[PDB]
Write a protein that binds this ligand. Structure first.
Ligand SMILES: CSCC/C(=N\Cc1c(COP(=O)(O)O)cnc(C)c1O)C(=O)O
Ligand SMILES: CSCC/C(=N\Cc1c(COP(=O)(O)O)cnc(C)c1O)C(=O)O
Ligand SMILES: CSCC/C(=N\Cc1c(COP(=O)(O)O)cnc(C)c1O)C(=O)O
Ligand SMILES: C/C=C(/N=C/c1c(COP(=O)(O)O)cnc(C)c1O)C(=O)O
Lengths: 387, 386, 384, 387
């Protein structure tokens, strides 16, 4: 069986005009040969293109690469991870439906689920999905979907994706998994029983900190068709240039992830043994609750994780005196980023949910890049040992 | 009174690193000076950027350009006209609300209002908005929005935006106008009393057929903040490169529109007097119902319009023997496009709505470009002779 | 008209795409050894490697070629790349070049510093007078190189008359028509062998690309130019060619506006008490107007005018609110510069005097803004 | 000392408008504050920009990255490797000067030195530079430059860069080295005594097969200023978009080269032991002449090399029956390329020079990518073992 490195470098499809790199189809529309040919494409008959919102060759090339690593029936690219998330939930959920979602989610996902979904008559509970019994207890006759992020942003809380998938499968609910934090090299939710696997491509998949985009992949042709139908009307599109950039970043995804995984673990171990650090939430550490599940259900770890300092002042002093790490939000970039969730990525999260998420002023999140790991550790060490 | 040509070519804002052209900020994230500075930005305090989904300087420069021409409090750019439409309606409407929309709308707008909105518990009635009395009769206690396209895609049906805005003002509803077909050079819905004006930037605004994008502009600061809050979560973003291309295309928008307008009128009059053509639906023709309203409420016309052949066979002959015009959906490009609405742009609209729209297999939609008109007419004359 | 031709270029669509795709690629795949071998021998149809040929760049080349009436066109990474490729592809040690005495600063640098290092004799002379061209002629003269109207003074050379001299005497005539665009000046139509442009100016028109183009009357000459380019390596990037082709779609319409704005502005300046003299080729007062009127079908909107002192020029250039102080020209928005300390600052003193470039001169490149707004900007800056 | 991976990911310079990724300055011109500020910039006084041909911020960012890895006084980026080679030779050589260049060079370099330089009154000899004594024997009173490619394209012939540099330094000649085949990760000619080190950035540096570009770096400020002065008039520029892409590709250069090097050596060893293969020219093999010089003077190897089949027909059969390798010219891409030098990259090389270079119809050149090496080897093996 051919390695994923090779698969990503050799995607299926004809070359265009013998071009080795796939061209950028910076076009809005496409030409018809005849009234019939154009009519037929609008009915889904024949091969070809109509209009970039319905399908653009460069974006489709990126979709096929993701589809190939997810093992999906199809993938849909979007203008952002939030586009993928809206389109993977609201394409299916309608008034009177019930959604169970993790209680520790990316801030704007909490915003979408707690502000917008209830306005559309959709019932939403945020539940601790690290415990399958709590998921079952929150289940209702109208539950149509469970939505999980695991490991969760930013605390890395692990959910039992396989265990929850069994209950979804028995009860007729879709299981949707945001695998952004781990990448499809290491977490393949469709292999664990999910119906839909999605990512912010803005993070690891693209990897170069220069594109916002999203992708969603479905286990069935019907589900990916419905998602694309929603996309056509909701309009979160990946631009041709951004698709060219995402496909290009993904060409190095397997080797970047290997380096991220190993750097991340080494940085977490360094932090865990350091006297200034109270606790390290990296799901690859034996000390981490849920390490046993992550180890079984994933084939590696991402390199974004959280650690606890002794105070807010210690956290600030660390974050502001680094020379290699960059103070900024986002994650999954080739270079190391660091931020303060309580006052940044999660500052818009309701106090109620903040308290249950376990997010405090002492926490710092680091997204470890592919720099030489000793250089990253020496940067953290000099800031930690400051006068 | 500085002219709009000059305004578009001289947008407000600082140069970046003294660059003459505005740089393409192909970035996802921005760096913070300190914890406090990043925290302040997240609370909307101070000046700066955080992350391109929240705000990208290249995208914002294009937003400022549109905002100036619309006379708006602010503008939001999107990944498509459908992103703008979605974000300008679903940012406000919620379960139990009622929407009144024009009966003649772009096909996917029909799909949005007719398939997705009701799944979200929003009641929707499509009605003939060319008669303000029919809008009044359709009104309900829970009516929160009227949504109009004028002239409508593809029949060019005209609504009294001004009269309808009075009714919305009186009865506590937002008026949203899709002004894609006319461009903001010739139609400024916020000057007519609308609350929101939006475009498929994919059409005239960009004008070069190489970008898909949307823009929406609101009369009030609170409404544009809501639109952008919805955009934050829904995620239809204009890419930095596309914003660079849309701003660049918009630099020639006023001259392109002058030519489109003059060209489309000349073509329509040629077709109207030709023996093979049953009727021509251009809002700038004296024969067109709604001409009197379009002339008073607009300062010009787009060049996309519809005409009727004597049979489907005839329309097919004409569409397939043109050498200059290109058979393709979309409109408002520098070159001439031609389309068959029944089986293309409006193929998916339900039979009953299609009947109400007056769309038949005999209709052909042309989007007249900025070619020498004599070439477009000769191309048409050529084909009609076969 | 020209607009229809530029909007409907010849060629096939790629994958039915309406906009021509951006071939952001270095290399192309071969179907077999034989097919790749054949392409390297110039047999069959297809591509090998973007330096030899890129489809997006070739589409832009074909657009310029059609408008110039050429046998072919070559795109480059800058106007300087087109210039050095249209001259050094032909001239060799022992050859002599006659060049206009007033040229863009970097062309002066090329001809004055580099060409003589390569054993090429160069005389800069006043090409507004054909007898001076004849008098400078030598048995080893192989090329005349003209800019008309010249940058920055707008000095006009008789292209047609010089072409007759060149044809009779076995020399190539190369014309840089940057200042006028191919809508208005078509040197190959006047007898020239090669016509070239800084695409960075009018042709692109949007101030966001640097590029060059050269067009040759003969198939053999464009082959030589591309052969030189293959080894010298000044290429137009596929993204820049996409942008250039895109800007060119509005070229004829922009040029009509530039021309009309520029004339109205020159006329305003010419009757202003603060202005000594306006060098615009379309003015009746300008020496060489009669040639320019006969050999061109319009005018660009870049031209020079004379203030009463350096201090006055500085005051004018530093109080404009619409016009931007920057080098370059032919952009949609109005640009203004000081040739003596900017574009022409490195020109040797003696060539400078021969050019007539003094610290009292300001060069303006009138954009497509409403002319009344640009006149009001100049007006307040001249009077307050 | 900080690792090169870290340096490339953290290049010196201020961020622009706090942007994490460096913006694309798609501009021709820049604005002046005043006539004095503009006048000064033209005199080289003060900080700022004028016009992209003279200096573009995005291009300068990429130049700084190369300069940092070369250990140079400065770097200049170009529209192509050939722009870099032209500008690194013709910026210095004039009529009456003499150039000694290697006899095995990239085809278009042979075209430049053999067709264009003599037209400009520059004397050129192509010499076997793998023998320092032959270089000395070719020396004349007017010799001003030696130009080397090592390992040479496509035979991998190795020159003694250090030994030749001694002779250049004693006699007042510049040494110019095209290090395209090896990359600046493994070959740093300025540390071996070269005055100028240059690359086709089109190959490894960019790495992604989607840009043509060049770069040249000089040991002295004076020489890089002269190179840029030439560039200003000859006009081979790197476009702002291309510079953004080259900088982006270069963020993964160290990890890509590590994999290229390891894959290329394993493929060479596989080929060297295979019955169908007559000889393998990879400078990292102990069997290769000049292996001892390459191993002392480089810190690794590129993964483009040539091998000899038993016949032209055998080469064609191999080249036309691969599923992973792509038949195409160029090299140094993430995916594996293969070509036939005799009829492709070197088909324009004059017969006498071909014979001097040792290029025959039996030779195949492979540029090994970063695919899983076992997939690459299995692809070659199945083609070699065809019916
Ligand atoms: C507060 S601003 C920083 C962005 C960010 N996270 C993003 C993200 C998204 C959304 O993806 P989009 O940004 O729309 O491509 C979806 N799902 C997950 C697990 C995510 O981590 C962060 O820094 O924690
Ligand atoms: C059937 S496919 C051709 C697209 C098309 N029209 C689009 C359009 C949109 C949507 O804008 P987006 O396409 O999302 O940028 C919004 N509003 C109006 C009046 C529109 O006409 C057409 O060819 O009639
Ligand atoms: C001092 S820097 C400003 C650039 C400039 N002129 C350029 C130019 C070129 C060169 O074109 P490239 O810049 O290489 O695309 C060629 N030919 C002509 C008639 C030109 O005017 C100027 O502002 O006068
Ligand atoms: C198709 C190109 C091949 N080579 C190129 C090359 C260049 C020239 O570099 P641009 O191509 O001008 O960037 C310079 N120096 C070296 C050692 C090279 O290999 C090839 O062999 O396959």
């Amino acid at each position: 069986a051919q390695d994923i490195t090779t698969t990503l470098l050799h995607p299926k499809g004809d070359h265009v005009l013998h071009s080795h790199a796939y061209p950028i189809f910076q076009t809005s529309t496409f030409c018809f040969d005849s009234t019939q040919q154009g009519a037929d494409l609008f009915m889904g008959k024949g091969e070809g293109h109509i209009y970039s919102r319905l399908g653009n060759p460069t974006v489709e090339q990126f979709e096929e690469m993701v589809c190939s690593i997810e093992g999906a029936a199809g993938s849909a690219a979007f203008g952002s991870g939030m586009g993928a998330i809206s389109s993977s939930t609201l394409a299916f959920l309608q008034k009177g439906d019930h959604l169970i979602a993790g209680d520790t989610l990316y801030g704007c996902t909490v915003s979408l689920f707690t502000h917008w979904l209830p306005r559309f008559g959709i019932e939403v509970d945020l539940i601790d999905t690290s415990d399958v019994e709590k998921v079952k207890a929150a289940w209702k006759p109208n539950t149509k979907m469970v939505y999980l992020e695991s490991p969760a942003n930013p605390t890395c809380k692990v959910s039992d994706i396989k265990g929850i998938a069994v209950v979804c499968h028995e009860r007729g609910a879709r299981l949707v998994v945001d695998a952004t934090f781990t990448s499809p090299c290491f977490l393949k939710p469709l292999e664990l029983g999910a119906d839909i696997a999605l990512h912010s491509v803005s993070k690891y998949i693209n990897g170069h900190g220069d594109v916002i985009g999203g992708v969603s992949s479905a286990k069935t042709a019907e589900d990916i068709a419905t998602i694309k139908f929603y996309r056509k009307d909701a309009g979160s599109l990946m631009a041709p240039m951004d698709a060219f950039l995402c496909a290009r970043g993904m060409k190095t995804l397997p080797i970047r992830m290997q380096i991220h995984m190993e750097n991340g673990l080494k940085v977490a171990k360094f932090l865990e043994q350091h006297e200034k650090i109270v606790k390290v939430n990296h799901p690859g550490l034996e000390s981490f609750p849920g390490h046993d599940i992550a180890k079984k259900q994933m084939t590696g770890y991402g390199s974004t994780f959280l650690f606890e300092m002794k105070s807010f002042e210690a956290a600030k002093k660390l974050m502001e005196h680094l020379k290699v790490c960059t103070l900024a939000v986002s994650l999954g970039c080739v270079d190391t980023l660091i931020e303060h969730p309580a006052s940044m990525t999660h500052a818009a999260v309701p106090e109620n949910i903040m308290r249950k998420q376990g997010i405090t002023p002492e926490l710092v999140r680091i997204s470890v890049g592919i720099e030489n790991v000793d250089d990253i550790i020496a940067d953290l060490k000099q800031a930690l040992e400051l006068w």
